[PDB]
Amino acid sequence: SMQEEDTFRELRIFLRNVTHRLAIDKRFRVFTKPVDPDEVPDYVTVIKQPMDLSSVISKIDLHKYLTVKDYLRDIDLICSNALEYNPDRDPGDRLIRHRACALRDTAYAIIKEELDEDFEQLCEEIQESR
Numbered sequence: 216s217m218q219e220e221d222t223f224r225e226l227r228i229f230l231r232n233v234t235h236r237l238a239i240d241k242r243f244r245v246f247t248k249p250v251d252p253d254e255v256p257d258y259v260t261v262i263k264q265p266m267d268l269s270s271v272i273s274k275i276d277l278h279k280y281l282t283v284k285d286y287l288r289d290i291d292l293i294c295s296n297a298l299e300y301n302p303d304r305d306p307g308d309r310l311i312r313h314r315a316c317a318l319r320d321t322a323y324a325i326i327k328e329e330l331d332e333d334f335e336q337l338c339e340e341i342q343e344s345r
């Protein structure tokens with residue numbers, strides 16, 4: 216119905232706003248775009264489902280997220296990919312792991328403060344009837 220389409224449009228507006236606020240944070244610049252295969256050749260072989268904030272924005276616009284839970288699975292993916300690909304004790308690896316965890320904690324914190332729980336429940340109940 217039109218009311219269900221209104222609900223998903225509001226969701227999309229909310230998710231774009233959250234993603235924009237992550238994307239403009241200097242700490243998270245490394246997660247804003249896909250990894251360049253020329254700079255990092257083995258990334259594509261090691262990381263089976265790459266994810267980045269530009270991809271997330273594309274998925275919002277393609278209507279791929281019908282709940283905030285689905286959205287947070289891709290934010291979690293951005294984080295777990297970074298922890299998987301950069302596991303070493305070296306400062307570079309430790310810096311990106313720290314930023315990846317900050318990205319994840321920041322996304323969850325914005326959602327905790329600004330997502331109405333009854334709005335998320337509505338989205339879930341529409342998706343389960345789809």
Ligand SMILES: Cc1cc2ccnc(N[C@@H]3CCNC[C@H]3OCC3CCCCC3)c2[nH]c1=O
Nearest residue numbers: 245246250255296297300301305307308310311
């Ligand atoms: C998403 C992503 C990008 C990336 C770019 C370059 N290098 C990476 N990994 C390196 C592996 C070897 N140890 C050093 C690592 O680079 C740490 C840098 C990454 C850019 C931000 C400052 C620290 C990359 N790994 C990735 O997961």
